[PDB]
Amino acid sequence: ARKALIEKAKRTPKFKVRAYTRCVRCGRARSVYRFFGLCRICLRELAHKGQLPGVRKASW
Amino acid sequence: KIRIKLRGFDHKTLDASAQKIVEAARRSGAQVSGPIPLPTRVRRFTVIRGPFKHKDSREHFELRTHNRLVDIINPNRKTIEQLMTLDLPTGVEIEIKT
Amino acid sequence: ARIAGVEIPRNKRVDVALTYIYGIGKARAKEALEKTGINPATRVKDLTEAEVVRLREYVENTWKLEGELRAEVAANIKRLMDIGCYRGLRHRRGLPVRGQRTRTNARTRKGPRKTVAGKKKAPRK
Amino acid sequence: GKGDRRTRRGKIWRGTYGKYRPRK
Amino acid sequence: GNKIHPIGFRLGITRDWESRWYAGKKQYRHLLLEDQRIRGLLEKELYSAGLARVDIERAADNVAVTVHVAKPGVVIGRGGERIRVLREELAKLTGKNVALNVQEVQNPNLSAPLVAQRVAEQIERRFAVRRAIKQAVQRVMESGAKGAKVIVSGRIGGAEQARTEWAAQGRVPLHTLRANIDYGFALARTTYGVLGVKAYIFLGEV
Amino acid sequence: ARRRRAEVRQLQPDLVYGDVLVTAFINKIMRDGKKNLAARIFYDACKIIQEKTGQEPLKVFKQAVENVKPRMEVRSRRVGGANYQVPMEVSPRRQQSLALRWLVQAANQRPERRAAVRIAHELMDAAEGKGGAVKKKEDVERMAEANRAYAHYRW
Amino acid sequence: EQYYGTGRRKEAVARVFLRPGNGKVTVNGQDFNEYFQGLVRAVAALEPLRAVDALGRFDAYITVRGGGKSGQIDAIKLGIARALVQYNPDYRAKLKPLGFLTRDARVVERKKYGKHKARRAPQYSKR
Amino acid sequence: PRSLKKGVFVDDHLLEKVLELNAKGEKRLIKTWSRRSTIVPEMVGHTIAVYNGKQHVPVYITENMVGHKLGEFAPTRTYRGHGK
RNA sequence: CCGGGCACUCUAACGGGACUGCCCGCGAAAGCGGGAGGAAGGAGGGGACGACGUCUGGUCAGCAUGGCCCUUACGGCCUGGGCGACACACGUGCUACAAUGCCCACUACAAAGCGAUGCCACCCGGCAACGGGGAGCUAAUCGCAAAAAGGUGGGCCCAGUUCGGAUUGGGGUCUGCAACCCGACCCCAUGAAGCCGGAAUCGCUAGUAAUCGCGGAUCAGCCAUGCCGCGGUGAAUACG
Ligand SMILES: [Mg+2]
Ligand SMILES: [Mg+2]
Ligand SMILES: [Mg+2]
Ligand SMILES: [Mg+2]
Ligand SMILES: [Mg+2]
Ligand SMILES: [Mg+2]
Ligand SMILES: [Zn+2]
């Protein structure tokens, strides 16, 4: 993740179709979850720490 | 005729709260419509276990949101007096609407 | 019953036989029979001289079929082809013209598969 | 079959609606 | 590549979250970022004190925050002026008007998060890894505990070939989903690269 | 099946003749778990069997089966080097498995367009002693005993 | 007066209200043979009645929701077998040797990740 | 079987730029990057040069190619066969 | 539907229930076989959970981090092109080669999910995608939704076909600043190969396989037949 590429934070994009996502935490982009703003990796990490309230290990 | 809708991630945190809201208003007024469960909406998160490749890792996560009803009909000042004053639960979000 | 350019359907239901004309099929077949009064289910043979008239009348005059159709289409393919047009090129090449992948499945367009030698020692999978 | 976009199943498959598969 | 986080593995059971606040499908990704932002500072401008857990509760623009530490004095400040600096400099991250707290760690020898830090600490200095581990395992074991285990990874001793030093006493039943095992990890920046440090502390069971 | 000796699934008897060999035969006809369409095809055939014949359906069915059952079959076996097709008895369990399978397979080899017809017929032919079913049954038995010499490998 | 059973099968629940009468059946307001038209299996649903000889003795009202009609047939079959017992507990001793009073616990297996269907495992080429 | 709807798009870079040329004469070549532009009658006769993503190519716009998007006459790939 | 009622279904929280406890036989014991009662029986079915270690395994392009390397450029912006190229080779899949089928109509059974500039009832315009209007719901109380296979009836009549939909011509909707390269969908026309696949090879032991449809994440839209998951119908076989 290039610091430079985290320009997305610029709520100023010529057209809204260019506005993407990026992880709040690692700055990823490939697979971020809207409900969390976190990427699939960051989500599992935080998830495990118990830092994601209510989130837990699904079993059934 | 106030309808209370309690929700939360922890089921006992509600069971706890909701129980209070009942025992409380169970004096100053009606005996409440009894706390009712209501189905639980569930969020799933299926994330590949490791970074890079290994498409078959996965690991399952879920965020379960519980609900309740209580429902108090016949509010009498004190009925509302036992409410606004006594509060506790943190993982419990309340919705009172008559 | 010669209903279109040298067209001649037969022994089957008409709504299925009109399909046999280069410019007609189900959609148009069910239309012409509808707006002609003929009961589709009737065998081309069982058709009535009169029916064969109304049918043929419409069909030939209500649309562009057989030979003329082919002529049109072909004329179009040359058209866009006689101008730099991408599609034009794709037609000259004989490769698909609708943004389909050509690294693989494009047989129906490329024709028979013509194998060549290669570089073995290396999992080409 | 599921392959034909202009039939009941064709639509259902592509999960679409149209002449061949009306929204009722 | 195996072994579930021992904490995440028992959240439902013997192990509460470090952030417990009601619903929110439109703000979750905001309160979370906040809870994060929070921990950001606290896990910095509060290191030297034994930051061993930052709990967080909420209720409509009201944050709790309970920083557990082995040396609260360092948190509070002279007479109590720093805990005042925090609170303010803290509400600079988020309006919210958030509280704060400083509950102490009654014996950091039974706090995995801390033990990790101690060992990672020495390593950062330049102590004998193997030693550091043996000792810590001891302390943790020394001060009660029913079992303990420490794991340093990296280029142990500045060596070129990465290895992994062990060490453990008593029981550390990672499978028994109820044991109540405190887990802790600590980094370790070094003149020659990182070293992970894992600490497992087994306390009671049921 | 290294451990136990695999139990034979016992299926619920026919809902018309209360017989199991029917359910058995019915399943063999069924495909893609459409046990209903499979159920018809058979029962219909049962009627055709009692129209194009005066005999009771169920007994004609029993007859087909009993005639398609091979009593000897040949199992291959590496001996000293080469794989000698070895003759040997067929267990009453397998005897039935092979019978119903063959019936259905043969039936679907027939030309009549309608499924039920093919079964009604092949069955009747089987009771008679003809049709692909019986052909295989006998082709098999012939195959075995034709490889007699290679039988002192009893197995 | 009246008798009842619950009966559930592979995710179908069937309220069975047995009652003395002709022998007609009402499944979801429809005639038993109308809700289950053209389903060879259908008959089975009432097999527990034939067991202790009823039907032409009882009349039954039936509720059925969830699953498929094949599953419902089975649940209905449980409910019937159950009510039958309330009417006469002594039925068990003869209604059970058939197992009608057993709740078939067979159920759709969870779709496991990695595999295509709980078990169907993706295939590999030249491994 | 192309699509657009109601507004047959054209980047006014060259549009306003082309109508000005009409007011006078024909400017030999008009380099553009508006590969996305729809060709219109006015453009006819002119000579807009489109980018491959590498070069600008001379494209004499005719009345029979009106409607086709610009570019589309400016191929991107450089393929001459695998043969050898 | 209404009054009304908590009985039943259900919803969800707690709790009971199975322990070889009970009878028979073998046994030194553990345990084995059989039987009863029971919804369930000997780990009742499925998950989560993966030992010390193994491979110089994978990832410095998630992140972090030692070292080396660039610092008017190996940094940064933009527009456009490319990642979508093809004579070819392979992997994983989808659709199919048909009558136990295809099609049109009428009619019936499900679960798990999702919904703010969101799901969209209903009405009107349009063959249609969709458009205009517009009720309800912040969602057990409204919507996506039609489940499909199935059942009843009718058509096709063994044909490369009313099988199968590739390919191409034409017209058009929607998203988006914009769909040439390079979106999806609708409608007309076109209507390919394919008749069940050589050597070789894969999955699955039961509510499994096989078959049928339904949801979700990402997401403006979508190249999803991928993936994660849900329920319907529901086998064959195992000597060894
Ligand atoms: Mg985007
Ligand atoms: Mg078709
Ligand atoms: Mg399934
Ligand atoms: Mg290596
Ligand atoms: Mg690519
Ligand atoms: Mg197995
Ligand atoms: Zn991340």
From Swiss-Prot, chain A:
GO terms for cellular component: cytoplasm; small ribosomal subunit. The keyword RNA-binding applies. It comes from the Bacteria. Keywords: Metal-binding, Ribonucleoprotein, Ribosomal protein, RNA-binding, rRNA-binding, Zinc. GO terms for molecular function: rRNA binding; structural constituent of ribosome; zinc ion binding. Zn(2+) binds at C23, C26, C39, C42. Binds 1 zinc ion per subunit. Signal peptide: none annotated. Its cofactor is Zn(2+). The keyword Disulfide bond does not apply. GO terms for biological process: translation. PANTHER family: 30S RIBOSOMAL PROTEIN S14, SMALL RIBOSOMAL SUBUNIT PROTEIN US14M. Belongs to the universal ribosomal protein uS14 family. Zinc-binding uS14 subfamily. Binds 16S rRNA, required for the assembly of 30S particles and may also be responsible for determining the conformation of the 16S rRNA at the A site. Part of the 30S ribosomal subunit. Contacts proteins S3 and S10. This is Small ribosomal subunit protein uS14. The lineage of its organism: Bacteria, Thermotogati, Deinococcota, Deinococci, Thermales. The gene is rpsZ.
Swiss-Prot record, chain B:
It comes from the Bacteria. The keyword Ribonucleoprotein applies. PROSITE patterns: RIBOSOMAL_S10. GO terms for cellular component: ribonucleoprotein complex; ribosome. One of its GO terms (molecular function) is structural constituent of ribosome. Keywords: Ribonucleoprotein, Ribosomal protein. The keyword Phosphoprotein does not apply. InterPro entries: Ribosomal_uS10, Ribosomal_uS10_CS, Ribosomal_uS10_dom, Ribosomal_uS10_dom_sf. HAMAP family: Ribosomal_uS10. Part of the 30S ribosomal subunit. Involved in the binding of tRNA to the ribosomes. Belongs to the universal ribosomal protein uS10 family. This is Small ribosomal subunit protein uS10. The lineage of its organism: Bacteria, Thermotogati, Deinococcota, Deinococci, Thermales.
Curated annotation (Swiss-Prot), chain D:
It comes from the Bacteria. It holds the Pfam family Thx. Keywords: Ribonucleoprotein, Ribosomal protein, RNA-binding, rRNA-binding. Residues 1-24 are annotated as: Disordered. Residues 1-12 have a biased composition (Basic residues). GO terms for cellular component: ribonucleoprotein complex; ribosome. InterPro entries: Ribosomal_bTHX, Ribosomal_bTHX/bTHXc/bTHXm. GO terms for molecular function: rRNA binding. The keyword DNA-binding does not apply. The keyword 4Fe-4S does not apply. Binds at the top of the head of the 30S subunit. It stabilizes a number of different RNA elements and thus is important for subunit structure. Part of the 30S ribosomal subunit. Belongs to the bacterial ribosomal protein bTHX family. This is Small ribosomal subunit protein bTHX. It comes from Thermus thermophilus. The lineage of its organism: Bacteria, Thermotogati, Deinococcota, Deinococci, Thermales.
Curated annotation (Swiss-Prot), chain F:
GO terms for biological process: translation. GO terms for cellular component: small ribosomal subunit. PROSITE patterns: RIBOSOMAL_S7. Keywords: Ribonucleoprotein, Ribosomal protein, RNA-binding, rRNA-binding, tRNA-binding. GO terms for molecular function: rRNA binding; structural constituent of ribosome; tRNA binding. Coiled coil: none annotated. Pfam families: Ribosomal_S7 (PF00177). The keyword Ribosomal protein applies. The keyword Ribonucleoprotein applies. It comes from the Bacteria. Gene3D superfamilies: Ribosomal protein S7 domain (1.10.455.10). Part of the 30S ribosomal subunit. Contacts proteins S9 and S11. Binds to the C-terminus of IF3 and to the C-terminus of Era. Belongs to the universal ribosomal protein uS7 family. One of the primary rRNA binding proteins, it binds directly to 3'-end of the 16S rRNA where it nucleates assembly of the head domain of the 30S subunit. Is located at the subunit interface close to the decoding center. Binds mRNA and the E site tRNA blocking its exit path in the ribosome. This blockage implies that this section of the ribosome must be able to move to release the deacetylated tRNA. NCBIfam families: rpsG_bact (TIGR01029). This is Small ribosomal subunit protein uS7.
